[PDB]
Design a protein around this ligand. Structure first.
Ligand SMILES: Nc1nc2c(ncn2[C@@H]2O[C@H](COP(=O)(O)OP(=O)(O)OP(=O)(O)O)[C@@H](O)[C@H]2O)c(=O)[nH]1
Length: 171
């Protein structure tokens, strides 16, 4: 019955499309066309999932999707400190400029990779380490997110929670 709009933003390759597709179809992919999806879920809610292009080239046009958004998911890769930094450097500021009062959920992605051997190896070779939970929770508090939630589109762990809370942030 109730219609809720949800826009997903964040650095390219943090897993925004896989996130939305894995949730809407319960399967893990990748479509190149930036699209919007939908889902009927009980929290009666018709959730509209709007994907975005995080590249800089679309900095000016991206925000055209923002108007009338009910809730935002600002995502960052749990195995990418760079995407973590850009949350406060770019995404939180951008969302707030266009939509000052709209609720925000901070989403950590690729949780399945935080414990991955070869992955930790890679980050280590660059003097970097995966974003621990406390760290993610800290950032959420900084930007005053309604909630901080970690998920994995590959295993779908915590996935259902992310969108349930994104909905409860509206109802
Ligand atoms: N291991 C693992 N890899 C993931 C997961 N989610 C996404 N990926 C990988 O991350 C890469 C980024 O995929 P996208 O979903 O397109 O990320 P995105 O750039 O933020 O979203 P779009 O630009 O809209 O496509 C893909 O090659 C996936 O294989 C995950 O949960 N676990």
């Amino acid at each position: 019955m109730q219609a809720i709009k949800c826009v997903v933003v964040g650095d390219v390759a943090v897993g925004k499309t896989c996130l939305l597709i894995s949730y809407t179809t319960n399967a893990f992919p990748i479509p190149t066309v930036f699209d919007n999806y939908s889902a009927n879920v009980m929290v009666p809610v018709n959730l509209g999932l709007w994907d975005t292009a995080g590249q800089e080239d679309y900095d000016r046009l991206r925000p055209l999707s923002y108007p009338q958004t009910d809730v935002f998911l600002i995502c960052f890769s749990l195995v990418s400190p760079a995407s973590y930094e850009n949350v406060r450097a770019k995404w939180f500021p951008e969302v707030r400029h266009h939509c000052p009062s709209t609720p925000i959920i901070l989403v950590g992605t690729k949780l399945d990779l935080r414990d991955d051997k070869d992955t930790i190896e890679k980050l280590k070779e660059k003097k970097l380490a995966p974003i621990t939970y406390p760290q993610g929770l800290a950032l959420a508090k900084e930007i005053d997110s309604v909630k901080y939630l970690e998920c994995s589109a590959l295993t779908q762990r915590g996935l259902k929670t992310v969108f349930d809370e994104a909905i409860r942030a509206v109802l």
